[PDB]
């Protein structure tokens, strides 16, 4: 009986879609709409 012992394997944390790739996926980005709003909200100079 020569049974080889089972090797320890290190499961990695698997990242399918990147974070920067996740919000990159929405047609409507609230962050840049609210921002686009206050950018408009500052259009008056005399």
């Amino acid at each position: 009986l020569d049974i080889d012992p089972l090797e320890n394997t290190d499961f990695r944390v698997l990242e399918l879609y990147s974070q920067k790739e996740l919000r990159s996926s929405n047609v409507f980005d609230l962050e840049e709409i609210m921002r686009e709003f206050n950018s408009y909200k500052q259009r008056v100079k005399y």
Partner: protein, 44 residues
């Protein structure tokens, strides 16, 4: 004719033909400020 010039900034890029607002002083008068503005936004 009036030429376009750059605004001041977001992801948007604006070009305007007038950078100020204007008016003047017997009876109630109503001035019109006309601005032509080309803006460039990213669309997803």
């Amino acid at each position: 004719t009036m030429q376009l010039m750059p605004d001041d900034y977001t992801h948007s890029t604006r070009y305007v033909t007038v950078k100020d607002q204007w008016h003047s002083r017997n009876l109630t008068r109503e001035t019109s400020n006309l601005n032509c503005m080309v803006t460039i936004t990213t669309a997803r």
